[PDB]
């Protein structure tokens, strides 16, 4: 129910190893010279 | 002995001699080809490799398993066969009676033959102890707050841990399963079909392996 010991900085950062986001899937739009999400329309 | 690969089509029934109802599974075992012969001298054991269900030839920029990649294409061409969707090894058979590139026809088996059928059972996803392990529910009334929980998972200070092998919730199904001592009811050379008495593992279209029964 409750933490028996406090979490060390090391353990917390190890846990957060995978807690991140990814760059979105994007492709260049030919006419406007900008970027958009793949399979999406401007 | 004997072996073949096929797809499970579905269940139906037939009427045997004296009219008894025989439930059966239809297996379509077309396009079986011996791709390789493994031997003790080279591989350390005797086996025949059988490919099943020809797939499309290699093409550039293929995006799915429908098209053979170059390693698979070379492996099949070495047998002078089209690339195959499913590849499995048979150790029960006698390798001296097969040639690389030869067809394995449904006519390999005969009605009355006793077989073992192997396949991947149907998946069920994340399931609890009641369904996955067939445990009892707690009471559904009389003040109960215990219905589908798994129950006690151990003992007290001894042993102060849960033993390996404790039955708990988790993914269910999708396991390799062998059903033993089924019978071949009918072999139909056209349509390349084998009728297996009873039922076999897996969903419809799932791959099944038919072998002569070990026992």
């Amino acid at each position: 129910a409750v933490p028996k010991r406090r979490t060390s900085k090391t353990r917390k950062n190890k846990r957060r190893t995978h807690f991140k986001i990814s760059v979105p899937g994007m492709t260049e739009c030919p006419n406007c010279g900008e970027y958009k999400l793949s399979h999406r329309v401007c | 002995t004997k072996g073949i690969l096929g797809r499970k089509i579905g269940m139906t029934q037939v009427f045997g001699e004296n009219g008894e109802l025989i439930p059966v599974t239809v297996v379509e075992a077309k396009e079986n080809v011996v791709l390789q012969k493994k031997t003790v001298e080279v591989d350390g054991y005797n086996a025949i490799q059988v490919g099943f269900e020809d797939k499309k030839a290699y093409k550039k920029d293929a995006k799915s398993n429908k098209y053979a990649n170059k390693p698979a294409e070379g492996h099949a061409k070495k047998a002078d066969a089209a690339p195959k969707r499913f590849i499995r090894e048979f150790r029960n058979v006698d390798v001296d009676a097969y040639e690389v590139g030869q067809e394995v026809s449904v006519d390999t088996f005969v009605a009355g033959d006793v077989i073992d059928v192997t396949g991947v059972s149907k998946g069920k996803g994340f399931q609890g102890a009641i369904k996955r392990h067939g445990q009892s529910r707690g009471p559904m009334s009389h003040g109960s707050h215990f219905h589908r929980a798994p129950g006690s998972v151990g003992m007290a200070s001894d042993a102060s841990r849960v033993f390996k092998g404790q039955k708990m919730p988790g993914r269910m199904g999708g396991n390799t399963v062998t059903v033993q001592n089924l019978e071949v009811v009918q072999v139909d050379t056209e349509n390349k079909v084998i009728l297996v008495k009873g039922n076999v593992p897996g969903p419809k279209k799932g791959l099944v392996e038919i072998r002569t029964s070990i026992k």
Partner: protein, 122 residues
């Protein structure tokens, strides 16, 4: 599909009218019995003057069930009620008459006297 506490009509003239199932015989942990199986039962309701009396603990063979039975040819037979016949150790009926239809599986069970006395065997 007969289990402990199932109440059954009696399809004979032995005196018992309704019985209550005490035990399904034929092995440890057996839960249910069907046509041709033998049960230990108690007579809950009896008619006057019969040989079998209320409160007696007797043995009976199941002769028809609502669940019915499946035959090897893929056919089924089902009845509108659960009825049994009080028997002796020799599998002969205790009564001298049988009422209503009984299943042909009794013949395979070797309850030939009951089959003979039945007005219809289906």
């Amino acid at each position: 599909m007969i289990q402990q506490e199932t109440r059954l009509k009696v399809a004979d003239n032995s005196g018992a009218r309704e019985v209550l199932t005490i035990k399904v015989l034929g092995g440890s942990g057996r839960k249910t019995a069907n046509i041709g199986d033998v049960i230990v039962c108690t007579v809950k309701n009896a008619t006057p003057g019969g040989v079998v009396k209320k409160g007696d603990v007797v043995k009976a063979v199941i002769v028809r069930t609502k669940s019915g039975v499946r035959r090897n040819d893929g056919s089924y037979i089902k009845f509108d009620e659960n009825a049994c016949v009080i028997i002796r150790d020799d599998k002969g009926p205790r009564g001298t008459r049988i009422f209503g239809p009984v299943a042909r599986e009794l013949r395979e069970g070797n309850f030939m006297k009951i089959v003979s006395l039945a007005p219809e065997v289906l």
